[PDB]
């Protein structure tokens, strides 16, 4: 549903 997203998180 997201045009821009990643599974990775900066923490």
């Amino acid at each position: 549903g997201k045009l821009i997203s990643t599974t990775a998180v900066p923490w």
Partner: antibody, heavy 125, light 106 residues
Framework: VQLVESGGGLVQPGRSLRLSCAAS????????MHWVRQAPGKGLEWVSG????????GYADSVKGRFTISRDNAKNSLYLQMNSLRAEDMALYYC???????????????????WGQGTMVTVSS | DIQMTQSPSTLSASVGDRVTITCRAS??????LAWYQQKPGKVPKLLIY???SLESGVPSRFSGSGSGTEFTLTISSLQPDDFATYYC???????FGPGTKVDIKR
Amino acid sequence: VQLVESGGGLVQPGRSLRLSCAASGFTFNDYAMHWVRQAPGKGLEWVSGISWDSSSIGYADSVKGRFTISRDNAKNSLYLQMNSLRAEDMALYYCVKGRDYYDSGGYFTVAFDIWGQGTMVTVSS
Amino acid sequence: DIQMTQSPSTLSASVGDRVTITCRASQSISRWLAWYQQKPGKVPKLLIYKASSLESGVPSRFSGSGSGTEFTLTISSLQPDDFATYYCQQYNSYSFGPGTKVDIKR
């Protein structure tokens, strides 16, 4: 905390410009970064964005195939390469810091919390 | 493609009024909606995000509600700092509403 855009100016239709944005006062690499534009006297239009880890990029339909977003984390900088410029691309271009949120297996922007003052792009023959 | 609409397009208000303005999405956007303030010649300012979270430092007279397709921004008691245009944006694909301008009633 600040976002300083440069690279704007006067360009003829069909020519190119490269915009720059230099970020300071926050950990630039930790955040999605975006470009938003505003034509004179008009509303806001999102142009392009890039996730904190550069793995995901998006463009407005109106610019895709002509604009390229990128970031250089080592230089705390965001860029927009704009080709085949048209009169309708005339606008003040803001560099914008995203604030991101994790939901349903994905990390995505939910707010634009810091905005640069903008660099003015004039497209005219 | 998600169309964001806003109503009213303009609003005449007085200091002390409670003003509520509306934003609507053409399909469900859950709670991924933010509200921005903008004044002539100035940069937009984040007010609310995730539909109802008030941004740090923003006065508490501002509140947002809604989920799905209908969203509202409320100013419980309009202050002179608040005459401005207000935009909503959805974060599935970043389209903005066309803005609501709140000017000074006379």
